[PDB]
Amino acid sequence: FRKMAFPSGKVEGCMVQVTCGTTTLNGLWLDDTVYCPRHVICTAEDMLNPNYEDLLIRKSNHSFLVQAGNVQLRVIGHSMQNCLLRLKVDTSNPKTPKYKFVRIQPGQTFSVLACYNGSPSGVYQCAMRPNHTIKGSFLNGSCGSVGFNIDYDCVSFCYMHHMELPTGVHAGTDLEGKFYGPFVDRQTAQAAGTDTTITLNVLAWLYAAVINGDRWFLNRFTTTLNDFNLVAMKYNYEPLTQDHVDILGPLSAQTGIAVLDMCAALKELLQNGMNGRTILGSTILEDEFTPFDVVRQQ
Amino acid sequence: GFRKMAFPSGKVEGCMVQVTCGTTTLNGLWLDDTVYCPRHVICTAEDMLNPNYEDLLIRKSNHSFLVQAGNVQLRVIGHSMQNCLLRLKVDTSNPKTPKYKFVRIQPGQTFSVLACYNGSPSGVYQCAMRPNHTIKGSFLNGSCGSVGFNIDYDCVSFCYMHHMELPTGVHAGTDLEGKFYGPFVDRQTAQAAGTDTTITLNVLAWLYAAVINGDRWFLNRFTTTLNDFNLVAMKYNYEPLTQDHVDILGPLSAQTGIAVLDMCAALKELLQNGMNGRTILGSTILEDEFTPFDVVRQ
Ligand SMILES: COc1cccc2[nH]c(C(=O)N[C@@H](CC(C)C)C(=O)N[C@@H](C[C@@H]3CCNC3=O)C(=O)c3nc4ccccc4s3)cc12
Ligand SMILES: COc1cccc2[nH]c(C(=O)N[C@@H](CC(C)C)C(=O)N[C@@H](C[C@@H]3CCNC3=O)C(=O)c3nc4ccccc4s3)cc12
């Protein structure tokens, strides 16, 4: 069982470089639109608070240097959408795939194409956390990198990188420029809400461990959903919904362990702890491996 | 802020095709006017237990190879075996052919895998060639012919093509010249690898990664000689350290400011006293699938 990313070629054909003054970041080229974080226009204005509507009226189309590989693209118009700029260019991307813009929900995963200077350097898998952060790997120059999923040749773009919190996690927006979480694009230290554990995915991981022949943690206690949810919240675990219990159906049928019986297993692990025991090799319960991942890889 | 990252797969995705002989369908790699694929695409369910490839191949003509690149079908105009691969000559040269080389990777080195099913890429992940010449991959039915690769600049270095899953769940395959890594043969039999060991040079590089990411709890005032460390390493199934390895860890040592043999003393302490419930870079186990080169790049 291992975390896999979606193949990145459909997105690589869209990455570009957007430069204002001495500041440059990544943008996404779809048809005749380039999307990028709006703070490419900042010149130290980012410190404290920038007035984006003022900075933007003060900018000409010629001040935007947009480069796709070797080619410079002429900016024909610009308008601001939330925390993103939409740049109109004179040529439509010959490599635009079928795409949509989606708002990823907590607990769901996506692939990140980390880019620097409009050039992709790496691909990895991420989870949107309940507190609306992601545990990414992003260095200076990463802003504008996108997260995405791919279904039947259609790219679902769900994220654009904007910032790294003081704790080392990362924050950003969907492709309409709406931030995930309560963060704002200014140069300030910001704090995320307490980060809860994705219970649906821990449970999925437990199911994967049982499929792997590792079942020391099972027991014969019973729990109701309500009584499991009250214990889980005491340990900063997300409560389980009835939809989540359904999502776990195929895995519970495959192993013969009823979902609520696995909850009774997890409940004991929360209350008694691992005690040095290991699950799939780790003393830590993994929560970024989804039931879909377990299902596909079993 | 540190994780396994795979190379962007775009240059490789544009080379994946589908090769069919009768009921059997495998992935193939299309470079210039040649398609490479595992030779047991010519196998029926009855030839698999102990087939004679020379015999089975003399019995086929170019017409019996249906090669599909996406929608398009390419005509085979010639064929030949190279070890455990077939090389099919096609009438059209792949216009998406990247700059490339064929290399044979040595144990401990890492690469990216593009997992393909029915000629179409489905996932990408990073993995390393184990000391016992297997890879700990994620390969399902229909994955044979998927390739492993590294990218330097704009040149794809192909190093792996996938053939088989051992009963232990690890995987075996060949370089692009069709020569298998390890003691394995392409037959439908249960085969065993040698006993695996831990890649010491990679654990050390990962410990440097942790120090560079601000995880220094495991460090200690002590130091050890290479010989002393090796005696300890042998006890815990770790590859012996070599002076060349220490030279490879030169640059990491300089940035960190920690002498290599100091890091070894820390590792000796982690082997002997465990991690005490502590985690390094978010992991409860000593990661050994990051090379010194990988840590630098990130
Ligand atoms: C340590 O806590 C802090 C305390 C006090 C202040 C702090 N600010 C930030 C913060 O993150 N600022 C944002 C930018 C703001 C405007 C959203 C930022 O630098 N984003 C990066 C990606 C970051 C960097 C490392 N990996 C992450 O992904 C991005 O490449 C961009 N670069 C530039 C460079 C020039 C112009 C625009 C951009 S936009 C953290 C922080
Ligand atoms: C007594 O038999 C066993 C006993 C104990 C363990 C065992 N392992 C294997 C074994 O691996 N066989 C090879 C094939 C051999 C001949 C190279 C095989 O099926 N490879 C797969 C990838 C495999 C499949 C599951 N995940 C892995 O990645 C592959 O994608 C290919 N598929 C086909 C399908 C039809 C025709 C050709 C090919 S080539 C057999 C076996």
Author numbering:
A (entry chain B): 3 to 300
B (entry chain A): 2 to 299
What text appears in the publication on this structure?
We also solved the crystal structures of YH-53 in complex with SARS-CoV and MERS-CoV Mpros at 2.04 Å and 1.99 Å resolutions, respectively. The SARS-CoV Mpro-YH-53 complex is crystallized in space group P1, while the MERS-CoV Mpro-YH-53 complex is crystallized in space group P212121. Compared overall, the SARS-CoV Mpro-YH-53 and MERS-CoV Mpro-YH-53 structures show high similarity with the SARS-CoV-2 Mpro-YH-53 structure, with the RMSD of equivalent Cɑ atoms being 1.040 Å and 1.322 Å, respectively. As in the case of the SARS-CoV-2 Mpro-YH-53 structure, ligands can be found in both protomer A and protomer B in the SARS-CoV Mpro-YH-53 and MERS-CoV Mpro-YH-53 structures. Particularly, YH-53 forms a C-S covalent bond with the catalytic cysteine residue of Mpros of SARS-CoV and MERS-CoV, and forms several hydrogen-bonding interactions with some conserved residues, as is the case with SARS-CoV-2 Mpro. The main differences for YH-53 interacting with Mpros of SARS-CoV-2, SARS-CoV, and MERS-CoV were observed at the P1′ and P3 subsites. In the SARS-CoV-YH-53 complex, the carbinol hydroxyl at the P1′ subsite forms an additional hydrogen-bonding interaction with the backbone NH of Ser144 when compared with SARS-CoV-2 Mpro-YH-53. Furthermore, the hydrogen bond between the methoxy group of YH-53 and Thr190 is impaired. According to a previous study, YH-53 showed an IC50 value of 0.74 µM against SARS-CoV Mpro, which together with the present study suggests that YH-53 is a broad-spectrum inhibitor against main protease of coronaviruses.
The main protease (Mpro), also called 3CLpro (3C-like protease), represents an attractive antiviral drug target. Mpro is able to cleave pp1a and pp1ab at 11 sites, catalyzing the formation of a series of non-structural proteins critical for virus replication and transcription. In fact, a variety of studies previously demonstrated that only the dimeric form of Mpro exhibits enzymatic activity. Here, we showed that a peptidomimetic compound with benzothiazolyl ketone as warhead, YH-53, is an effective inhibitor of SARS-CoV-2, SARS-CoV, and MERS-CoV Mpros.
